[PDB]
Amino acid sequence: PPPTPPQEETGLVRLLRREIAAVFRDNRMIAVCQHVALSAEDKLLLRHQLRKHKILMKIFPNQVLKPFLEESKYQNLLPLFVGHNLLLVSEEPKVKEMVRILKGIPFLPLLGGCIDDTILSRQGFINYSKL
């Protein structure tokens, strides 16, 4: 191969890195939920039902999310992000209220997550909920 042409970070990449660092700092509950194709109406309704319990949703590209997460303390979440995904952000978490809405839609799975530094599968969220 030709010698190595190092690529340079854009402002986009740095803004995303900053934003994601802040995202992992602030919210106590970060729940990975596979992004699923819905009507715009239904996605808006979902965002609003999350607005009622104050929970926020966020979406980042795998491109800039994966290296950040493999260098992060959170690297055990790497196998989760291989497909499409949606990041559920919660400050001052109540999990049972998120599970309430996720229950309404059967085809919209909750996969992994971390609640107050505790990395859990869906069953861990079912357990944290009943608590």
């Binding site: 854009t10 986009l12 990449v13 590209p61 795998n62 491109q63 800039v64």
Partner: protein, 222 residues
């Protein structure tokens, strides 16, 4: 995910009034009475005049030699005028209106009897000359798209070019000729009259260097 790129911005482009192409006249206002002999030598070989850009960044470039008559001008004018945004683009004639008288005889005449009568006028165009020059706040690609039509409908072979494209192909042209592996170039042989080759060559060849033959120009010829 794909990262963006800075878009080319034109703050420096000043659009002139009457951006569209001027109407050109079928016959000059002072019609030539005296019938001229036909230099074919004005179509022949490389072009001297009009080889460079002036205001605009795009052009139609003539790869052959030829004659442009009024029909051609009409074609270019109409096509370019309705294919451009008069706000964002302007065009310019790099070619004079047809000045050169060309004769005919009535079909069915015997040979001899005199010269003919003046049928129409034309403009001579030598290979390497810009026909039409378009500037604007445009990117090259749009202009290229519709300019290639006009280019294709001209008598000679022709291309659509930008400043970048032109300098690209000139540097490529000279780089091809300093790369050349075989010792034997048309120049080297002709100038030194090797094999008495001058016998078969024209004098003009010493300048043309085998790149131009008649009105034809083949760029591949080093």
């Amino acid at each position: 995910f794909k990262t963006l790129l800075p878009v080319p911005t034109f703050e420096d482009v000043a659009i002139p009034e009457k951006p569209k192409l001027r109407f050109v006249e079928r016959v000059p206002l002072v019609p030539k009475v005296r019938r001229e002999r036909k230099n074919l030598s004005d179509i022949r070989g490389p072009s001297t005049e009009a080889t460079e850009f002036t205001e605009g960044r795009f052009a139609i470039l003539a790869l052959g030699g030829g004659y442009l008559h009024w029909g051609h001008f009409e074609m270019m004018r109409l096509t370019i005028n309705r294919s451009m945004d008069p706000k964002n683009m302007f065009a310019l004639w790099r070619v004079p209106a047809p000045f050169k008288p060309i004769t005919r005889k009535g079909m069915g005449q015997r040979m001899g009897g005199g010269k003919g009568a003046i049928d129409h006028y034309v403009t001579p165009v030598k290979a390497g000359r810009l026909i039409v020059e378009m500037g604007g706040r445009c990117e090259f690609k749009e202009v290229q798209g519709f300019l290639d039509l006009v280019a294709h409908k001209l008598p000679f072979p022709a291309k659509a070019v930008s400043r970048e494209t032109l300098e690209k192909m000139r540097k490529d042209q000279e780089e091809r000729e300093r790369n050349n592996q075989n010792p034997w170039t048309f120049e080297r042989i002709a100038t030194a009259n090797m094999l008495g080759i001058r016998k078969v060559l024209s004098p003009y060849d010493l300048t043309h260097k085998g790149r131009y033959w008649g009105k034809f120009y083949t760029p591949e010829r080093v």
